Amino acid sequence: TYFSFWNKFSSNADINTMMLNNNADQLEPFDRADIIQDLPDFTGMNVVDVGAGIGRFTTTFAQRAKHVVSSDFIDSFIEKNKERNAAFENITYQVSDALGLQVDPQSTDLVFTNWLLMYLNEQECVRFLMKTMEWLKPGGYLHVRESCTEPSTGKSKTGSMHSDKKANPTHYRYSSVYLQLLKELRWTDARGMQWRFNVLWAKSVPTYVERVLNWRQVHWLCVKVPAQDGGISNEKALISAMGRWKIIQDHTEYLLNGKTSWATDVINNVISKVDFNLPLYVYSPRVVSPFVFVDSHNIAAMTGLSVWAVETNPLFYRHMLNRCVEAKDRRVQYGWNADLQSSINDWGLKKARFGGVIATELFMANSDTSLMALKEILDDNANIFTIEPALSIEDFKENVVVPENMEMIAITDVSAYVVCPCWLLVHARLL
Numbered sequence: 485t486y487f488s489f490w491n492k493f494s495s496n497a498d499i500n501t502m503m504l505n506n507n508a509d510q511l512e513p514f515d516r517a518d519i520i521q522d523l524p525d526f527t528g529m530n531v532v533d534v535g536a537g538i539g540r541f542t543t544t545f546a547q548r549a550k551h552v553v554s555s556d557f558i559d560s561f562i563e564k565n566k567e568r569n570a571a572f573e574n575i576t577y578q579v580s581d582a583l584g585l586q587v588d589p590q591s592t593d594l595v596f597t598n599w600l601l602m603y604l605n606e607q608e609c610v611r612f613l614m615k616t617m618e619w620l621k622p623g624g625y626l627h628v629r630e631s632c633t634e635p636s637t638g639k640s641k642t643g644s645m646h647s648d649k650k651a652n653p654t655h656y657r658y659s660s661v662y663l664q665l666l667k668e669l670r671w672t673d674a675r676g677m678q679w680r681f682n683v684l685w686a687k688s689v690p691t692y693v694e695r696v697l698n699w700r701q702v703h704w705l706c707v708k709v710p711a712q713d714g715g716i717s718n719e720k721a722l723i724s725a726m727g728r729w730k731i732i733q734d735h736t737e738y739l740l741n742g743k744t745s746w747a748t749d750v751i752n753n754v755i756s757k758v759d760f761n762l763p764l765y766v767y768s769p770r771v772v773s774p775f776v777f778v779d780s781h782n783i784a785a786m787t788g789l790s791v792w793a794v795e796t797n798p799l800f801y802r803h804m805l806n807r808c809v810e811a812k813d814r815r816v817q818y819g820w821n822a823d824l825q826s827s828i829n830d831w832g833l834k835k836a837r838f839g840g841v842i843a844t845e846l847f848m849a850n851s852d853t854s855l856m857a858l859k860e861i862l863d864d865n866a867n868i869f870t871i872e873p874a875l876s877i878e879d880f881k882e883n884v885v886v887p888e889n890m891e892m893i894a895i896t897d898v899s900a901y902v903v904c905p906c907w908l909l910v911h912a913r914l915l
């Protein structure tokens with residue numbers, strides 16, 4: 485049982501236990517800062533911290549929040565929580581299972597969790613997510629962070645508090661399973677309106693990339709938004725979907741493992757000629773083929789620059805996280821976003837800038853408005869290289885809209901190089 489697994493740490497109510505890591509003091513302040521800085525401004529918010537343990541995130545929320553409900557099902561973690569946070573007067577405490585937490589409906593601006601769904605069975609996962617829908621105001625936020633595929637301490641097990649003599653009951657699910665669950669969930673309120681989670685992004689916690697070489701500490705930020713259309717509303721269908729999504733992912737690995745991108749020869753060649761201080765932005769949606777993508781690890785090895793790469797298909801995003809763990813190149817990080825605009829939205833809010841773009845199907849896959857918005861996250865006169873499928877140069881040139889703030893300086897037939905159909909290398913620059 486998960487309660488007895490955690491209750492046995494009752495006398496170790498400390499940071500090591502919260503991260504199940506004997507070296508947590510090398511990680512905790514950086515992990516906390518990574519998570520906090522990706523959250524919305526929670527000044528004046530009603531926050532709910534579920535599975536809070538001793539309350540390390542509650543300590544930070546209390547500085548600015550209107551109110552924090554801080555909850556956990558281990559009584560002595562809440563006792564240490566109250567002791568550590570005794571100076572604050574804006575925190576109420578509940579010893580409760582996440583599922584039995586009492587929160588008023590439409591009362592909460594942020595439901596915050598960090599390592600929780602991995603301690604719930606599939607049925608409990610779904611029921612809990614539906615509880616957060618009920619607690620959240622419209623436009624409210626849900627934060628989820630989970631250990632995907634393997635424990636946070638990774639294969640080395642260095643510093644892990646998991647006993648080698650006892651089984652570990654934790655569920656280490658695929659990041660693509662949680663992502664689809666959040667994407668497809670639907671909930672109907674007491675007045676008959678249906679809602680969904682707008683999943684703003686999926687990201688790896690950088691502290692664990694940098695210090696643990698673990699890209700599979702994945703977290704998500706979601707907004708509760710109206711949804712007349714549906715994904716899956718039935719709880720039992722949602723439960724079954726989680727198993728189907730795992731199977732589909734296993735077949736994606738079987739298909740993709742060890743296959744190099746058909747675009748790799750062209751990209752290596754031109755990028756070997758170009759000089760791009762800033763990270764590079766990589767975008768790979770894989771619209772026409774699962775085998776046409778940007779090899780970010782080759783970009784980083786050749787340019788020496790850090791790379792932020794976006795995959796918009798949850799299955800391919802998860803596969804590239806696998807590749808990151810295998811390559812162990814800290815310069816490369818992957819993210820998931822619904823589309824280009826979602827990525828621009830996030831990075832623009834951070835006022836981040838990228839030194840150039842290397843993409844496949846950037847024009848094939850994206851609206852005119854989003855391509856026009858891309859300048860918001862790019863350095864001045866940044867250059868964009870994208871491999872585009874087309875019927876012909878004339879087909880492409882007709883009915884492609886060049887954003888007013890850039891110009892295409894080359895549309896080169898590279899069809900003979902993108903092979904196991906017409907492929908164009910489009911070279912553009914910001915004006």
Ligand SMILES: Nc1ncnc2c1ncn2[C@@H]1O[C@H](CSCC[C@H](N)C(=O)O)[C@@H](O)[C@H]1O
Pocket residue numbers: 486490501502503534535536537538539540541555556557558561580581582583597598599600603
């Ligand atoms: N079903 C459940 N309901 C409430 N708390 C739970 C729970 N399952 C696990 N927990 C608690 O969730 C915590 C996971 S360890 C993570 C603690 C905290 N979120 C942090 O990041 O620092 C533990 O404190 C454990 O006791």
